[PDB]
Design a protein around this motif. Sequence first.
Motif, PDB file in Angstrom:
ATOM      1  N   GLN A  14     -12.516  -0.365   2.976  1.00 50.21           N
ATOM      2  CA  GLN A  14     -12.326  -1.526   2.083  1.00 50.21           C
ATOM      3  C   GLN A  14     -10.853  -1.719   1.711  1.00 50.21           C
ATOM      4  N   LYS A  15     -10.135  -0.627   1.422  1.00 45.75           N
ATOM      5  CA  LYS A  15      -8.710  -0.692   1.106  1.00 45.75           C
ATOM      6  C   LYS A  15      -7.930  -1.182   2.298  1.00 45.75           C
ATOM      7  N   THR A  16      -8.370  -0.806   3.500  1.00 45.95           N
ATOM      8  CA  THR A  16      -7.734  -1.308   4.723  1.00 45.95           C
ATOM      9  C   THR A  16      -7.870  -2.820   4.889  1.00 45.95           C
TER      10      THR A  16
ATOM     11  N   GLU B 280      -8.569  -5.008   2.630  1.00 46.67           N
ATOM     12  CA  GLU B 280      -7.857  -5.672   1.566  1.00 46.67           C
ATOM     13  C   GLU B 280      -6.340  -5.699   1.699  1.00 46.67           C
ATOM     14  N   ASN B 281      -5.740  -4.719   2.343  1.00 42.02           N
ATOM     15  CA  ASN B 281      -4.277  -4.573   2.313  1.00 42.02           C
ATOM     16  C   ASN B 281      -3.537  -4.909   3.626  1.00 42.02           C
ATOM     17  N   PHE B 282      -4.279  -5.128   4.711  1.00 36.05           N
ATOM     18  CA  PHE B 282      -3.714  -5.423   6.023  1.00 36.05           C
ATOM     19  C   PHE B 282      -4.289  -6.728   6.589  1.00 36.05           C
ATOM     20  N   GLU B 283      -3.485  -7.399   7.406  1.00 30.47           N
ATOM     21  CA  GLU B 283      -3.835  -8.706   7.934  1.00 30.47           C
ATOM     22  C   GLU B 283      -4.591  -8.621   9.247  1.00 30.47           C
TER      23      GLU B 283
ATOM     24  N   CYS C 104      -2.615   6.823  -1.908  1.00 28.45           N
ATOM     25  CA  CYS C 104      -4.002   6.617  -1.450  1.00 28.45           C
ATOM     26  C   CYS C 104      -4.594   7.914  -0.927  1.00 28.45           C
TER      27      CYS C 104
ATOM     28  N   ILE D  62       0.844  -1.228   0.000  1.00 24.97           N
ATOM     29  CA  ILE D  62       0.000   0.000   0.000  1.00 24.97           C
ATOM     30  C   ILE D  62       0.871   1.266   0.000  1.00 24.97           C
ATOM     31  N   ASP D  63       0.697   2.101  -1.024  1.00 29.11           N
ATOM     32  CA  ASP D  63       1.387   3.378  -1.146  1.00 29.11           C
ATOM     33  C   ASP D  63       0.490   4.467  -0.469  1.00 29.11           C
TER      34      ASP D  63
ATOM     35  N   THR E  22     -12.078   3.821   1.930  1.00 27.97           N
ATOM     36  CA  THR E  22     -10.934   3.796   2.839  1.00 27.97           C
ATOM     37  C   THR E  22     -10.927   2.476   3.646  1.00 27.97           C
TER      38      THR E  22
ATOM     39  N   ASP F 230      -1.815  -4.135  12.680  1.00 24.87           N
ATOM     40  CA  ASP F 230      -0.979  -3.540  11.639  1.00 24.87           C
ATOM     41  C   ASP F 230      -1.631  -2.313  10.978  1.00 24.87           C
TER      42      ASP F 230
END
Lengths: 227, 227
Positions: free
Chosen positions: B27-29, B31-34, A6, A1-2, B25, B142
Amino acid sequence: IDIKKCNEQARDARLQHLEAQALETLQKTVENFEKPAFPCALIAGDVVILDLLHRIGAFSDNKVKIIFIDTFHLFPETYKFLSEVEERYGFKAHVFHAADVNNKEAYDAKFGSDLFITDIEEYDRICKVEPFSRALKTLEVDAMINGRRRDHGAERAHLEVFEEGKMVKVQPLAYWEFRDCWDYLTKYSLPYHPLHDQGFPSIGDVQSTIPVPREKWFEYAGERSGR
Amino acid sequence: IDIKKCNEQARDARLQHLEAQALETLQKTVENFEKPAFPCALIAGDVVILDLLHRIGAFSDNKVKIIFIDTFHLFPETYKFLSEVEERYGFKAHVFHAADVNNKEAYDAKFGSDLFITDIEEYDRICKVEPFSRALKTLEVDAMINGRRRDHGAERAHLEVFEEGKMVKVQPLAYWEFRDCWDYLTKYSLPYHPLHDQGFPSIGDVQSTIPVPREKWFEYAGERSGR
């Protein structure tokens, strides 16, 4: 993630919203009023509003009139810039100034060059307030487009895109922050008042315009904090 | 032209934009973090964020954990409201409290019931700061979703939807005003903390929660001005 990317994408979508809101507000204004006008002092949000009016074709048939108040104490740069936007967007401003006085030398002869210091209230009446009031009456303005924004704070903090009155007031940029105005100017590579490059977020009369540290410009109520 | 109706339509479009920004915002979270988590104090923006997590299915997948810091000095109403949102949205909060003490009576025995008066710095460390820090470490968070907003002012004034760090911080409501959070709760008929009806814009520990006149809530930096 950049993260930077974003954040930029979110501000990109923000500015698209703010542009749509402003444009819709201006289009409703031209459709619903006979004699709309915009008093323009050529500061940053004012230049944004000129460009938005141009975009919706508000100058093609002189639908929207531009009012310019010449106080006889503006920066030389301000008169030069007015000429440039007039040419860029194809309108001529309707200029109002102190009653019965053709220019600064005539003003000095009638009222004294140092009126602004000895009686600022009389100076304001003669050079600012009476000419503005006369401009609205002369042009029979039924909707006054203006650059007031909520992030001016105090009595402007709760403005909406329209304000009721015998003469309606229209704030296309009600929800735009100062920073959003600057992102628009940057996005469309628009010329702005050169004194913004010399540290002035807002620009008025030479005797009463003061610079503001750049780190303060984008705080709430920062634009007009010089005064 | 119906001024009220036009203003309402503009704010309607504003809230649709803000909702899309917050949802995207979140949804991107996911998708990109565990191990994303949201420390939730059940104030108005926090209730908004719970609803938005629900709408993107963050509780069905168990994708996002809710952290609740029990200081042992919260309002009774706050514990009741926590149980209600847990049931409404289908999650159980991960509760952290003062180290090694199971409840307020055990806290009183170890530290004294009047610690908040006699040494507020120790109280903050024990009941608030250390449990929060331990929550984040224990759950290996994270990305920390939170309710900080720009209209909180001061050090929050220039927050964006993401903030860089070893642990990323996510502000879905960065560009929402307090007023926009309330409009959301009203639009979707969402229950909110009952103490807002007693004049508290913000709600924390009984000894430190101060009412604020309603007419001041929607000024810039108004929500937390009780302090």
